[PDB]
Design a protein around this nucleic acid. Sequence first.
DNA 1: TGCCCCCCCTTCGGTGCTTTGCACCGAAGGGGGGG
Lengths: 553, 406
Amino acid sequence: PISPIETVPVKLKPGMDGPKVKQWPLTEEKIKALVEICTEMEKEGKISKIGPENPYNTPVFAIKKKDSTKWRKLVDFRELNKRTQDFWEVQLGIPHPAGLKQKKSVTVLDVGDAFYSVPLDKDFRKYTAFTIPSINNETPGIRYQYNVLPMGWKGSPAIMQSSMTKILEPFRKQNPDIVIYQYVDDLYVGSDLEIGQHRTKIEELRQHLLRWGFTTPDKKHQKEPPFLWMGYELHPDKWTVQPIVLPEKDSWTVNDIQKLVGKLNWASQIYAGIKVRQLSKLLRGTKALTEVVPLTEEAELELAENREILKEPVHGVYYDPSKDLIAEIQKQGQGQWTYQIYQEPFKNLKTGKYARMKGAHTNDVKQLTEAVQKIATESIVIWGKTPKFKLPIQKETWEAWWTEYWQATWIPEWEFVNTPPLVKLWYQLEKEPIIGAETFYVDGAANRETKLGKAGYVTDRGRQKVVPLTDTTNQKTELQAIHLALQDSGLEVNIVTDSQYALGIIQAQPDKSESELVSQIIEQLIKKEKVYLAWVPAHKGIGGNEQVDKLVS
Amino acid sequence: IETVPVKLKPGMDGPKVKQWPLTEEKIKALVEICTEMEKEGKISKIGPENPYNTPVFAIKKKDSTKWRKLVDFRELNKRTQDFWEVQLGIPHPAGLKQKKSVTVLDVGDAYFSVPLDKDFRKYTAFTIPSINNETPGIRYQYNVLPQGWKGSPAIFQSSMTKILEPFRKQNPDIVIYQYMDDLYVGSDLEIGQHRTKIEELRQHLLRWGGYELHPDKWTVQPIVLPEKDSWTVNDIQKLVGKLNWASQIYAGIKVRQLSKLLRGTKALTEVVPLTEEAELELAENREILKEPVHGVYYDPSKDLIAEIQKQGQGQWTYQIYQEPFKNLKTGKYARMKGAHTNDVKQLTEAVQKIATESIVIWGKTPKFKLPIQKETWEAWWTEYWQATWIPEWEFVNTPPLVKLWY
DNA sequence: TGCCCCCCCTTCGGTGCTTTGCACCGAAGGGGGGG
Ligand SMILES: Nc1ccn([C@H]2C[C@H](O)[C@@H](COP(=O)(O)OP(=O)(O)OP(=O)(O)O)O2)c(=O)n1
Ligand SMILES: [Mg+2]
């Protein structure tokens, strides 16, 4: 029945009127199915017939619901949504089963036709008008307007969720040791009461909902485990995901691979070790969802690795506030990381992965810091605190990073864990110049108009060189000059550039880059024994720099 | 009482900023604080038909366990009308930075006794989140002058003047400066006698409705040049590059006579003797760097900017300017926490003290340029914030080319 | 042929710098999942 709750007032955006779009013509057979749908809603007062004075319209359709014999009605409010006022959505996130505590007695209820039991602001209803064409448009046809929240309107989800929160608020305060997870219209209700008094409180909640017009059909009332909830299965001591089925295909299109990656991401919350870097790489540089992409060798391997992981069964456990949260991260290669969160060993609450490339140039320590940050945020959301960490980086390594790196950087209290591959700085720059090492004065210049440049050096041991460069930039020639000095020097080198751009990248100790040229420089720094790297201002006659600058010119 | 008509700036809409996640202890505190405020009618439960939002969180001082709600109105304040356009703004007294000690008092509670323009309240909505998204967010808007809104000190200015003037009447030697929800009260009395007239001030206000700063210890540290008795080619290149940078700030600094000391393609570790004409150049440049730069004055119509550099071993350098290379203040912040393991905590405390100094000195906070990744800052900073205000800031990544400020 | 939310991966376009490309960042496309 329609809630007697007060309506929420809503406005159109200023200056805008209502939608006015002819319903697409449809067959007479579907038209009276249409007719059928509205006749019965009209008997519950969910809609009312209107006429030609109302100058607005919007078209209607329906999709099969997974019910045996039920259907979903929908009206294409795309245009009205555009002209409706902006809303502050109150759904801030998705509850996760790893955030639940063990409960003695559990129930899952769903409200029936939640949207159609919430009324719509009276002054607004005339903008929800829709027409059902009659006699193949020979006559004007039947016209209705909504008296309740329409499915397909921009404001319906928020107003319904907001209305449910006010209806639940009395019952939550009345009995504070009953957990109620409220997701749209789905209610998880847990308690530490014996199943006797539990079911009393349940019936009492149901009656409270029904006085406000929210039915709870028996069909959607789950009373025994395993409970179906939010895509998972809740068992008394553990939880699992509902079965994940991945596409198996002879020929793969872009859109197929897009679906596969998304399934694997969804699986990564409980299946440890999932990787998607090589599968997602197939989507780069493509131009159509229907374009057929052949799997690379590395993508077949990664897919096969994920398939072996997924055929093992797995479960998460529930949250024990009386114990610490522990998060352990492993390194997987090519910028991929995987993590487990647990409280007792080998009993995961959940798992996850971090694999984003932030920036054109980075290194493992930065990315480890980013994974730590992602896990820290996820933990606040699910449990309201951050975990203690277990990381495969030595205290010496981290300390060498936050001293020789100029940006403030911190990670929370952690313990070293020996699970190779370890995270390590792949080279360090000397703080002082190296005695007995050759001194290279590097420089590169480019002509922006011609896109032609040179890179070269001169040396205290008397060495000199100049390489022509075609189709390059100013910044590339400078990187190129450092590239050659590292190429032609020994294990220990002193280098002096006048490009703080180049100094800026390299001083940050990157171990990977989207640039092949920067990648080449990294491979060379890793081979070296000692490197000192010094900057000087250009075009000031400084001995060394001016010699090489003149040579490059 | 009658409300004062308030407007946003022409062509601007209210704030639409997402709530970020909060820990358990902070969510609990907001829920206790906000439900007591709703009972007293200071805020009102609202729904999603209000399209505006502003992030909220909570801060607990080391000295006082009592939690303090803190709303980030930074966006709202940028879009609110000037109250210097309506001339309802309050000036800053240049007699505060002269004082021996300055205490800071949180007087935000005085605002909760003045109603806010019915048409403006919707712009003040905020949303309390849910652990594990157990429920949708809970929304309120203010009915009274909000803490942290730039309009509250302006609307309530007149009320503040009359509450204080007996105290100012009776202590003409003390200077009191309101800055948003805070009173900065400075005096020259002895360390323990100063504190007692602080508590006398408290109960005059308590009748109706942090720690001691010390400004004359806010030493200015300038640009320094090393001194050794031997000088390598690398030492002179590092010094030439450092003074070539300083010539953008100071005037009459020359490098011609240390530059061609390095004539030729030399090794970096070869020890070059100093010309007499080079010691002439260097001993001179050292004292242009001695005393401050002629011709740099504060301008209240322009913003203040603050740059910070991490230097290591717990130390942090900073510069405050309005035009580039015309610093009004250069300083060095040190950490006395003793933990010696946090870089974000140190920077967070550095921003509060630097900002505090600009309030005492100029009456407003600068926009910071922070040497940290956006996502590292945002993961942790609220853990260490203790001020009732929040400055503007942006994130920068510039490696040192010179270590100019060491 | 509809709506709202979270997540990930890719691509695109705006901003600002004592630039002439570059690096950063937010938004919008695709996908997963929930209702
Ligand atoms: N494809 C979908 C699924 C759900 N919803 C919104 C409207 C629904 O009212 C509500 C909940 O959907 P349910 O699956 O729980 O089923 P109904 O509420 O529509 O009907 P009933 O629960 O009585 O079977 O979420 C939607 O707009 N589109
Ligand atoms: Mg329902």
